[PDB]
Amino acid sequence: DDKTITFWHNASAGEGRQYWENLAKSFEEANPGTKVEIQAIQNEDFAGKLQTAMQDPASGPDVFMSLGGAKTKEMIDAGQVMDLTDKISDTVKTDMKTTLSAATFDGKVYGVPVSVEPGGMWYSKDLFKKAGVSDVPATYEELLADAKKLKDSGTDAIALGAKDAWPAAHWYYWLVLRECSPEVYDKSVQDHDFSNACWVNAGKKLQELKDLKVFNDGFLTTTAQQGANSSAGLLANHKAAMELMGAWEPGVLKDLTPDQKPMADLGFFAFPEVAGGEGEPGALMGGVTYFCVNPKASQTSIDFVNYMGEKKNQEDYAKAFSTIPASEPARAVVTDESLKQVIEYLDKAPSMQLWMDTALGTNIGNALNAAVVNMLSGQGSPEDIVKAMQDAAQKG
Template sequence: MKRTCALIAAAVLVAGCGGGQTATTEPEEGGAPGKVTLEWWHLSTSDPLKTIYETRAKEYQAANPNITVKMTVLENEAYKAKLTTLTQSGKAPDVFATWGGGVLKQQVDAGLIKDISADVDLTNFTTASMAAYQFDGKTYALPTDIGMVGFWYNKKHFEKAGIAEPPTTWTGFLDAVKKLKAAGITPIALAGKEKWPGHYYWAYLAMRIAGLPALQQAGTDHDFTKPEFVQAGQQLKALVDLEPFQRGFLGAGYSTPDGQSASVANGKATMELMGQWAPTVQADSGEGLGEDLGFFPFPEVEGGKGAITEAFGGGGGMAVGADAPKEALDFLKFLTSTENHTKAVESGAVLPVLKGVESAVKDENLKVVAESLASATGFQLYLDQAYPPAVGAEVNDSVAELFAGAKTPEQVAQDITEVAKSESE
């Protein structure tokens, strides 16, 4: 799943209140269980996941003859529009795809989502995979996929510049940038025109300096002017001041022939900070690095409250409508069982959300990501999904202006705060 899809998905807004959409139930004579039609909405319109989900529905129906699973399958934009229309009427599908975070919280607050905390066993799910679907100690969805952002890099460039190992500290990262420049190599490719790739830097630095609880607290008190958030901008400015990006980066796209991904794929730049889809996009937009492509997590910032084992990214899950019948939750448990999830991971469609399933990942690059996620001690959802969409958009815009030299770190923090407070009123 490309990040552009995630951005579109983050724009889903909900309003209204009331119960969820109720499945169709036809009672049978003699008190026998009635026939049930489950409304299942998802957005896996392409294979392998499209066929996998069709197969799961048929298998579940075969094992439960009284149940019919009616699928509504839409691509991101259409899904966003249709789900918004339904939730605004105070209803929700029986089982439906969610990205968690701020949008799911709005749906929970509107009374549209079932609290499944007491009905599911979460011990087999990884810590990172559950982060986007839990609020105030309660669980409102189960994850089906997860991913994280990290540095994808050219191993040969590192070797040429005398960098023995990927940096694990921010100081070490800045030193690596200097070494690459000294060797005549462009250190980093960035799609400045599209803004969202740049916000990854500020978000990760905020995580590493302020810590995950501070980001969560900012979602409540709407205050991003605290010293740690300003420091995140200052450290990002320290990177920008090294002029590490490719020429014309402010006008560059992400997946275009001369954009961020292609610059790394064609050996014109060494690194990009990007999600788990990076190798696929690199292969589509450029030559690709093959075995010379490596991955490492965003470094720790010395003295910061965050840890290198805390990941930043997104994923997908399934929620149950507030008024859905008990069969809806049973179907969700079936979808996320170890056996069925392993099959989806083996197909390359998703990354593991269950412990011990990392071995099912076949792609070597994705296996590194999966192992990082499996051992993650914390997880932060994309800021434009964790917070209301307007706040996420302001993060993107303000950070882009910092890259361009048009805003100071203090102005970035202040402007994000103003939008956050305005949205909370």
Template sequence: MGDPALSRRGFLAASTAAGLGMTALSGCGGDSDGGSSSGTTTIEWWNISTTQPTKDVWAALAKKFEARNPTVKVKIVQLENDAYKSKMTALIASGKLPDIFHTWGGGVLKQQVDAGLVEELGDRTKGWADGLLPVAKEPYLIDEKVYGIPFDIGMVGFWYNKALFEKAGVTTPPATWSGFLDAVRALKSENVTPLALAGKEKWPGMYYWAYLAMRVAGADAVQKAADEKDFTGPEFVEAGRKLKELSDLRPFQKGFLGAAYSTPTGQAATVGNGKAAMELMGQWAPVVEADAGKGLGDGLGFFPFPAVEGGRGAITEVFGGGGGHALRRGAPQAAVDFLKFFASAASDRELVKKTGVLPVVPAAESALTDPNLTSVQRQLKAATGFQLYLDQAYAPAVGQEVNDSVAALLAGSKSAEQVAESITKVAKEAQ
């Protein structure tokens, strides 16, 4: 889409970034703080909003900001999720970040902060940032200091095609893991593909393992494993076995291992075009389904990840996050002013109405009318635990290993035990 696909993915190698070309790297943090001989300050804004309508809505907001600030120009660089991460990896290595850049917070942002590349925003934003929803700000707090400003918050859950559920005789969204597997079997019996998955991009598969770990072990145990850098406990192995149990049913669309997320033949389009009954995805899913495919409109429903019988995790413990913006260290005041404008009640209402994000400004909640997004927000407010996307919560190398190992399990080349061991090995090495 997070793309509103503020979708969470681990960093790729810096060498990959070099292969993508360096066109978008030019000018980062260059003369943007010094302006030009004409007295105009140019701020460079990197984001991942490549899908519609978000791409145009964000561009229009930048134009509105420029109109209110005639001496400021906003240079927008929009990159698809994985390309963005690759190029950011190269920028971190170069020590030069854009004036304003997309962030999911967590361990990835901490790495950038530890490298001395990110502006601490507490004093520069206190007058207005204090009014934002506290849960939305959490991922951007590092050592109790503010390094990012949120524009979205949400959770991952199952988005489903009501008509296909009805066709298979699934009258109620499943609330338990065994009930979910029964629903998968019922859909397959009617020759309906139960699930769409972007196996090529790996991060969507991670969602399943992360949620199963939360449901089996509990959110606190997941946090403890991260702190102790040890995921070899029986609960984490059991999470992998549960995922293998699902995978053995062959629930995903044909060719899922080579499928992307937001392309015309990818995961979102497969659901949006009615060719699969479900996808496990964040709150941006309806917008991307409609952009990549036809979209389901009122025919789309939402339900939380089911509880695992006998597990210690509650169905009210949620997995997700949002999107935010950070500034490079030494960014000009115009960049701070843009963050304030973007986080205003008026801008947030526009984002909620037009792009499907959930409000981070309390005054913008009245703009939320979509019943599915209202359901997401209601479940977020009732959450008893919250876990940030693993490939953003953890150090980049660890997050990438989670994605890679789970992808290998889904491809049949790693066991549940090997997934837990591989993640633990990389976590200990990253100390």
């Protein structure tokens, strides 16, 4: 059946999970005969099942969340993603111009975005004040100093979902972005060249954080978003002072609070500048969530991804996920004070890089993320991290 489509997403939080249910039925009532069969998938399994299912597109999902960056390009090159350049709506083209560049490859659009989520530090304002930190750290040393004060204050300074690998790696990403010059960074991503001292230095700076032992005790067995004891859950329940995460954070937090309501004292501050770093000041790194269409899918799928781009639907998305919607007009409904900061910093930032692992691809990304965890477990060095990236890069 054409008008029956298979829809894959990663919304495991209650409110966002329900948004998709309500969106599907809304699309089903406006387009009688259509049927959207939804599959909710935990984020850490998403890349695995998508790549596994799409090696035979005939029996894969019709509409699915993209993996992003080079990971999207891997699927595009493999013939697993449909060109939507001449298929996206005038609404999507107009309202979502800036986020559309993240789904644009070789001058061709391969998805409809729904949110833009820059990275940064999310923290408890109350835990900070309870440690004598009345001002956000502007530099990396200040951040280390503040973590010391939090540790003395009895609380774990930094929640880290190291079992999922990438949340730990995010500290390495940001440090590389801050240490390496914009060109060294660009060419390193484009050419997979990690020979510059940038990459070791960033690993060394991160090793210093590790040696302070200011993480939550079970960080190696802690996931990012699963349960009250996840790194996000620790922040939500004030068991930890902060964590380094994408702007999906407030929506994840409001799912893990004891009342499942928005975290009352959530604040945001950009990743600190690094003294002696050649990185461009104020350089953003983040994500852009968009949805792709199976090359073997019907027009019904196309009508569905464009339906997401609708301003009303984008706003309900912003409310349900407590995030920044991809649609510019839809951003008018954002009320979370920490998010309105991020939107402000978004409009006046020079660049926004994608996540480092998603920008380097599956092979390099997974190698890098694992290597960081190895170094953090004491079973690795900053040099091993770079060695791991170079090793995986041989495959492509």
